[PDB]
Design a protein around this ligand. Structure first.
Ligand SMILES: *[C@@H]1O[C@H](CO)[C@@H](O)[C@H](O)[C@H]1NC(C)=O
Length: 113
């Protein structure tokens, strides 16, 4: 069962440029998720918690709001080395953090959302 707007191949789910504002329902066996070029501003805490085999998430070219709602996503991206190449998300919001990369924001800048 592959999510309606997306395309699937094996355990990979490609939702690249489908104009998504939220996550679709994902198969529990998903190992890779292509979310490049959508309209996501954040993902809810624990969004990938039911995807135990998720190894890779492509998240670039989304309008990320870099506030306290992005705490979970940052923690996911920062946990282990193999996620490093996909980790450099660019903030577009708030205007104070526009153009900044997520990994190098001091807690100071993210806490006070
Ligand atoms: C993505 O957001 C933009 C506004 O910046 C607009 O084109 C539309 O709401 C969304 N795109 C698609 C393809 O749905």
């Amino acid at each position: 069962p592959c999510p309606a707007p997306c395309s699937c191949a094996g355990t990979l789910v490609d939702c690249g440029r489908r104009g998504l504002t939220a996550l679709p329902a994902l198969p529990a066996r998903t190992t890779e998720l292509v979310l490049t070029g959508n309209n996501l501003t954040s993902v809810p805490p624990g969004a990938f918690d039911h995807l135990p085999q998720l190894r890779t998430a492509h998240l670039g070219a989304n309008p990320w709001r870099c506030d306290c709602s992005l705490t979970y996503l940052r923690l996911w991206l920062e946990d282990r080395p193999e996620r490093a190449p996909y980790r450099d998300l660019r903030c577009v919001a708030p205007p104070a953090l526009r153009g900044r990369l997520l990994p190098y924001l001091a807690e100071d800048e993210l806490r006070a959302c």
